[PDB]
C-alpha cells in the first residue's frame, strides 16, 4: 500500500498508487549546464538505490541523480578528481577526455560502457555495483562498469569488447523467455572475453509489466551476486565456470 508522487518533466504532478512489487518512490533529476534542470518522479522497484553520475561532454556538464525512499509520498519533497567524456559528442571515442572534480566525498570515478543510451560515459558518481567493476556480454550486448576511488583512476583508452581477448571459456547466449528467446534451438555458444568467464543466466522481469525475462552470456564474477545492466527489475542470477554449463539444462 505505497503511494508516490508521479511527476512528468513539465511539472504535471499527481499521486500514484504503487503496483505490487514497487515498494519505493523515486525522484530522478537531470541538470544540464553550459543551467537546465529536469525532475521526474513515480513509484519504483524494490531494488532501486540512490545513485549519481556526472560527466562533461565538451562545454556542457550533465548531472544525473536518483534518490529513493519507501514512505508514503516521500517523493514530494525537493574532492576526488576524475576523467570525464561522453559518446553524445564523440568525446570519449575521440580521446578528448577532460578532468572533472567530484563534489561529494561519496562519488567515485566511473567508466561505463553500454554497447547496444550513450555507448561510453566517464565521470563522477556512484552506481549500483560500484565498489569495483563488472562486465557482461552476449549475442548482442556488452556492458562494463568500472568504479574506483583514486585520482583519475578511470583514465585511459576507452574499453571496447574487441580489445578484450577470447579466454577459451564458452557460454550460451540468448534473451527473452525460456520458451521464446532462450530455447535449446535459439541459444548458442559464444566466446567469452577477458575477465568474463562466468557462464551466466539472469531471470527476472523486463518490458512494461512483470513479463518474465531471461538473459544468458559471459560475465565477470562480480555479476553473480544488478539488473540495470540487463534492463530488468528483480534479477535472479546463476553462474558456473564450465564451458556450456550455461545451457537451458
Amino acid at each position: 500500500s505505497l503511494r508516490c508522487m508521479q511527476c512528468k518533466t513539465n511539472g504535471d504532478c499527481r499521486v500514484e498508487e504503487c503496483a505490487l512489487g514497487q515498494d519505493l518512490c523515486r525522484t530522478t533529476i537531470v541538470r544540464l549546464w553550459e543551467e537546465l534542470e529536469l525532475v521526474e518522479k513515480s513509484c519504483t522497484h524494490s531494488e532501486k538505490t540512490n545513485r549519481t553520475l556526472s560527466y562533461r561532454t565538451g562545454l556542457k556538464i550533465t548531472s544525473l541523480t536518483e534518490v529513493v525512499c519507501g514512505l508514503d509520498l516521500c517523493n514530494q519533497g525537493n574532492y576526488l578528481e576524475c576523467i570525464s567524456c561522453g559518446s553524445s559528442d564523440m568525446s570519449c571515442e575521440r580521446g578528448r577526455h577532460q578532468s572533472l572534480q567530484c563534489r561529494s566525498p561519496e562519488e567515485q570515478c566511473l567508466d561505463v560502457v553500454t554497447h547496444w543510451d550513450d555507448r561510453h560515459l566517464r565521470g563522477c558518481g556512484y552506481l549500483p555495483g560500484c565498489p569495483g567493476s563488472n562486465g557482461f556480454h552476449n549475442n548482442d550486448t556488452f556492458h562494463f562498469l568500472k568504479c574506483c576511488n583514486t585520482t583519475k583512476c578511470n583514465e585511459g583508452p576507452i574499453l571496447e569488447l574487441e580489445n578484450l581477448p577470447q579466454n577459451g571459456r564458452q557460454c550460451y547466449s540468448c534473451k527473452g523467455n525460456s520458451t521464446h528467446g532462450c530455447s535449446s534451438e535459439e541459444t548458442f555458444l559464444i566466446d567469452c572475453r577477458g575477465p568474463m568467464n562466468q557462464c551466466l543466466v539472469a531471470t527476472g522481469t523486463h518490458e512494461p509489466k512483470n513479463q518474465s525475462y531471461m538473459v544468458r552470456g559471459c560475465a565477470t564474477a562480480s555479476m553473480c551476486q544488478l539488473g540495470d545492466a540487463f534492463s530488468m527489475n528483480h534479477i535472479d542470477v546463476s553462474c558456473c565456470t564450465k564451458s556450456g554449463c550455461n545451457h537451458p539444462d
Partner: antibody
Framework: GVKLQQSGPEVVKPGASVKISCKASGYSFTNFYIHWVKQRPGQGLEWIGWIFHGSDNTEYNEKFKDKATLTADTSSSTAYMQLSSLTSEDSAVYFC???????????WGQGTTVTVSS | DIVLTQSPDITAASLGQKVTITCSASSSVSYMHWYQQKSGTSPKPWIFEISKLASGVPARFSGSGSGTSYSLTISSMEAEDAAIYYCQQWNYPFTFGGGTKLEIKR
C-alpha cells in the same frame, strides 16, 4: 614485489604422477589468470592451460586435457599443476605465468624442471 | 587452430645488421606479442600488443603487423640480442610460434 614462486626440480619415475606449485605474491591472486607452459629440452613453448580464482574455473589445451590438472589453494595464493602417467615426453621445464593487465604473459615463474626417470 | 609460423628458423646476423623476424598466422589475430628467451630460462616479455616495448627493452627493437602477419625488427643487431624469440597470439589458444634462434654471425 609481484612474482610467481615455483617449487623445486623433480625426478619422477615413469608412470607416476607429479604436482608442482606456483606461489603468487605481490598482487591479488584471485583477479588474474595463471597460465602453465611446457618446454621440452631444446624445443618450443606449449600452452597447457589456465586457472582463474579457483580449481573450479580452468581451461585446458586439448592436448593436455588428459595429462594435466590445474588447481589452486586460494588461502595461500598458490596454483598447482598435476601431471600423471609420466613418460619421457613429459620431461621438461614447466613455467607458470600471469596473464597481466595488457593481456600478455607479463610475470613468469622461474620454471620447474621435471625429469621422468627410473 | 590458428597456426603460427615463425621465420626465419635460425639466422646469424652480423653486429650492426638489420634483423627482421616474422610470424605468419593461419588466421587473423588482433594482437601479437613477442618474448625473448636465453639459455632455456624464463621467457621475458619483449614486445606486447604488437608494438609496445616491455620495460628495459632497447630502442633498437620494434614490432609491427596486423591480421595475419607480424614482425619483430632489430634495426642494429647487438651481441646481447642473441637469443630465441617467440611470437604468441594474445588470445585463447595462446599458441607460441616455433621460435627464431638469433645468433651472431662472425
Amino acid at each position: 614485489g609481484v612474482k610467481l614462486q615455483q617449487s623445486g626440480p623433480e625426478v619422477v619415475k615413469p608412470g607416476a604422477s607429479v604436482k608442482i606449485s606456483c606461489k603468487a605474491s605481490g598482487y591479488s591472486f584471485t583477479n588474474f589468470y595463471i597460465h602453465w607452459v611446457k618446454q621440452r629440452p631444446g624445443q618450443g613453448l606449449e600452452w597447457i592451460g589456465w586457472i582463474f580464482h579457483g580449481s573450479d574455473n580452468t581451461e585446458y589445451n586439448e592436448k593436455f586435457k588428459d595429462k594435466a590438472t590445474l588447481t589452486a589453494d586460494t588461502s595461500s595464493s598458490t596454483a598447482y599443476m598435476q601431471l600423471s602417467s609420466l613418460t619421457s615426453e613429459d620431461s621438461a621445464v614447466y613455467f607458470c605465468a600471469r596473464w597481466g593487465p595488457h593481456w600478455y604473459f607479463d610475470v613468469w615463474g622461474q620454471g620447474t624442471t621435471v625429469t621422468v626417470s627410473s | 587452430d590458428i597456426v603460427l609460423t615463425q621465420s626465419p628458423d635460425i639466422t646469424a646476423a652480423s653486429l650492426g645488421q638489420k634483423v627482421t623476424i616474422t610470424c605468419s598466422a593461419s588466421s587473423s589475430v588482433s594482437y601479437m606479442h613477442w618474448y625473448q628467451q636465453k639459455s632455456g630460462t624464463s621467457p621475458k616479455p619483449w614486445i606486447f600488443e604488437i608494438s609496445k616495448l616491455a620495460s628495459g627493452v632497447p630502442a633498437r627493437f620494434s614490432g609491427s603487423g596486423s591480421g595475419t602477419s607480424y614482425s619483430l625488427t632489430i634495426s642494429s643487431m647487438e651481441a646481447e640480442d642473441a637469443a630465441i624469440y617467440y611470437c604468441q597470439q594474445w588470445n585463447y589458444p595462446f599458441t607460441f610460434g616455433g621460435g627464431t634462434k638469433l645468433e651472431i654471425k662472425r
